[PDB]
Amino acid sequence: TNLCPFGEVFNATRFASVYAWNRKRISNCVADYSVLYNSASFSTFKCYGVSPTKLNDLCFTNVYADSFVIRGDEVRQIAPGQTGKIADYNYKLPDDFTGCVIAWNSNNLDSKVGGNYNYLYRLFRKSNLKPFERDISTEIYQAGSTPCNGVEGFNCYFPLHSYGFQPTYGVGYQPYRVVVLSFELLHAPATVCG
Amino acid sequence: STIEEQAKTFLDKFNHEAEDLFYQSSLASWNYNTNITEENVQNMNNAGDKWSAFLKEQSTLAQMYPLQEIQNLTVKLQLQALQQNGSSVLSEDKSKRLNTILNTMSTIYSTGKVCNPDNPQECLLLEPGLNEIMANSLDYNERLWAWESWRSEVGKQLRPLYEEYVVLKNEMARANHYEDYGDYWRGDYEVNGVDGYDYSRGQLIEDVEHTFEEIKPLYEHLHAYVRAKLMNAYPSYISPIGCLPAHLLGDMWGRFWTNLYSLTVPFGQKPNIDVTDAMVDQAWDAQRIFKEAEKFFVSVGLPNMTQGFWENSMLTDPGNVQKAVCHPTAWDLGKGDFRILMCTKVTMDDFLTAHHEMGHIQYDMAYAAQPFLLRNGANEGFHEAVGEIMSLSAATPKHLKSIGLLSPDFQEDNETEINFLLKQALTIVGTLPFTYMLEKWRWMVFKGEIPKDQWMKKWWEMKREIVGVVEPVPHDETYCDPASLFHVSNDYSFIRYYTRTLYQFQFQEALCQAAKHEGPLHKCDISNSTEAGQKLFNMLRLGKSEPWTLALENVVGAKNMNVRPLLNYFEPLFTWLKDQNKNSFVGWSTDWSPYAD
Ligand SMILES: *[C@@H]1O[C@H](CO)[C@@H](O)[C@H](O)[C@H]1NC(C)=O
Ligand SMILES: *[C@@H]1O[C@H](CO)[C@@H](O)[C@H](O)[C@H]1NC(C)=O
Ligand SMILES: *[C@@H]1O[C@H](CO)[C@@H](O)[C@H](O)[C@H]1NC(C)=O
Ligand SMILES: *[C@@H]1O[C@H](CO)[C@@H](O)[C@H](O)[C@H]1NC(C)=O
Ligand SMILES: *[C@@H]1O[C@H](CO)[C@@H](O)[C@H](O)[C@H]1NC(C)=O
């Protein structure tokens, strides 16, 4: 009966960086995606599997809302069947995706002259991520054969690097806040619909 | 595990470092360039030193990667450009000696000044004093005085300085397995490791001498015509067979000949084409000029300027409140920021310079996808060529009428087109002998093919044999008259202008032939023909991730610099000069002198 809390997640004031993409669970509520679809504020709105209208009158067991910030160009990499730094090392979308992808420009807040260095992304990794796996480690990267034991240097690299967000960036480099939704159906009753 | 993947990882870190640091440096330099104060100088110099120190440290750290162990030619090109330590290889005392002599020469040239024997307190920097003196004053003695005075004041100073600089730079080049500094510069065109597209550094010299040999007739007839006109202007000074005295070349050295136009225009009663009045009478301002050039570039299918350019750039002089040194420049601040810095005075010349700089901006927008080290021209000459072709394609009378900015009934005729082509050939065809002569002299100097105490003796020789120039005053070995120039004194490569000029007309003719234009090449316009647009974009989007010969054949279908498009473009002018020259001797003797008569 009570409304789903899309408010506190969709436009709060501080999003989590991509490598620690903030996940939130949605259940036991009624959802109204119509304001979302007709908002016309998001400069990127795409998804795969359900119609933006029909999803309003459908019932699901649990919903998951991932949220983070990325660069402009790289927003395309959030899609089943892409590859790249965000799809390789930082986030994974399974090709059997079920949710939706919402992306809106964020040059409003997330950037400030002198560079906003609070947003990070994982630049190197030994292997590519699995679907919906999040890695927060920061162990120095063994680029060579000699182990490093936690030191920066030749063939020993730091695995996190900071987005140099500024307000004077092109459209492909101004930040972009992104929310990705997924639904799942199980044996239990579908407590999420409206 | 291997060397390839590890160099991959390393460069993948070096990018996301150098991008940020280069943004900081370039943004600080921009803030300085629009608002000249002390604190901006501070921020700019600190950020620039930080960036340069990062670059040096990264070069040193990168030389630990074995080059020949690399196959993927992108990684090999980036590693080659990065690992070249350069001046960082000398002994530190020698490095400080280099910086010392460089700063002395640069500052001496940037502040040197001259005045007549009558008022030792009323005197001028070259710009704009000696500039306008050589540019508009028609007094023979005045111009000769300016000539000898500027050739004596900075020349004798930098002469031994330039000797020492040549020595130290030869050492710097030989340190990194480059036979001399000339070869170091030529190492920009060098291409290896690609079958059917390799290019050796001496192959460049061969090609340049070749192309100049074929251009020689056009320039010789141009010089004959101009000598005839100047004899009609200064008969008591020029020989009907002797070379042209340099101090009449509409400039202190003759980099261009533009200022001779009014002095040599054939049909001096013809109203020249100029839309200045037509521009102002329609309330044309900065925003309008640049919107028009942007609409041009959209016409041929290239993408249009992102909003950042309209918001951030400086199109209009910032009044008298704050000052800026607005030589018209285009800035790629990286990370998707493009700007233009220009004090646009509403004229025609500026309506062309706007197209030129916006073409630079288009070329930079094209290859924002290539990794950092490749975000540049394919060679040191593609940028200015891609710039110039747009200006010459949008300066045509047909295009001018197309935007209504010209009276639709202005009638093209032989007279106006000969005037237009003479303007062009005085701008472009005049500068090629000068560029080639100077670069060849500097190469020969660096190769040790000349004793030092003989430099000047050889220098004016080549002009006497190439550019038809003769000095009105005997200059001895204490001068270093070439040093009196910007690029000579500031140590810049100078053949990029030759390569720009020739690639310009290759590109222009290929693009027109892609637009199915019928008629003379000069009246061609590329507008509304998306075919030429895509044909050019297929070369733009590469950067330097490919050998320049490959990107050149992607457009002109040739594999080398080739003059034939130039001669094609100038054919009507060449015929007209052949008619006009039947009454004058073409060529020059090498013994006639203005001072030893
Ligand atoms: C949150 O506020 C922003 C800014 O007005 C708006 O774009 C967005 O649509 C809002 N969220 C929802 C769910 O409408
Ligand atoms: C120019 O620089 C000065 C010194 O920092 C600054 O006070 C001024 O605001 C700048 N000009 C503009 C238009 O911001
Ligand atoms: C060379 O490396 C780039 C990425 O740096 C890659 O896209 C390209 O495929 C590589 N070349 C070959 C022949 O695999
Ligand atoms: C560039 O041209 C396209 C043509 O479809 C247009 O949609 C777009 O708005 C133009 N860009 C700008 C910044 O106006
Ligand atoms: C280009 O096409 C537009 C629209 O078709 C037209 O208004 C303009 O005059 C054309 N310009 C040229 C140079 O063909």
Residue numbers in the entry:
A (entry chain E): 333 to 526
B (entry chain A): 19 to 615
Article passage:
Human angiotensin-converting enzyme 2 (hACE2) has been demonstrated as the functional receptor for SARS-CoV-27,8. SARS-CoV-2 cannot infect standard laboratory mice due to inefficient interactions between the receptor-binding domain (RBD) of Spike (S) protein and mouse ACE2 (mACE2). Deep sequencing identified three amino acid substitutions, N501Y, Q493H, and K417N, at the receptor binding domain (RBD) of MASCp36, during in vivo passaging. Cryo-electron microscopy analysis of human ACE2 (hACE2), or mouse ACE2 (mACE2), in complex with the RBD of MASCp36, at 3.1 to 3.7 Å resolution, reveals the molecular basis for the receptor-binding switch.
Specially, single (N501Y), double (Q493H, N501Y), and triple (K417N, Q493H, N501Y) mutations in the RBD were identified in MASCp6, MASCp25, and MASCp36, respectively. All three RBD mutants could bind to hACE2 with affinities at nanomole (ranging from 500 to 20 nM). Interestingly, compared to RBDMACSp6 with a mutation of N501Y, RBDMACSp25, which contains an extra Q493H substitution, showed an enhanced binding affinity to hACE2. Meanwhile, the atomic structures of hACE2 in complex with RBDMACSp6, RBDMACSp25, or RBDMACSp36 were also solved at 3.1–3.7 Å. The same as RBDMACSp36–mACE2 complex, the interaction region could be divided into three patches, the three adaption-mutated residues (K417N, located at PI; Q493H, located at PII; and N501Y, located at PIII) were located at the three patches, respectively. The extensive hydrophobic interactions in PIII were constructed by Y501, T500 in the RBD and Y41, L45 in the hACE2, salt bridge interactions in PII were formed by H493 in the RBD and E35 in the hACE2.
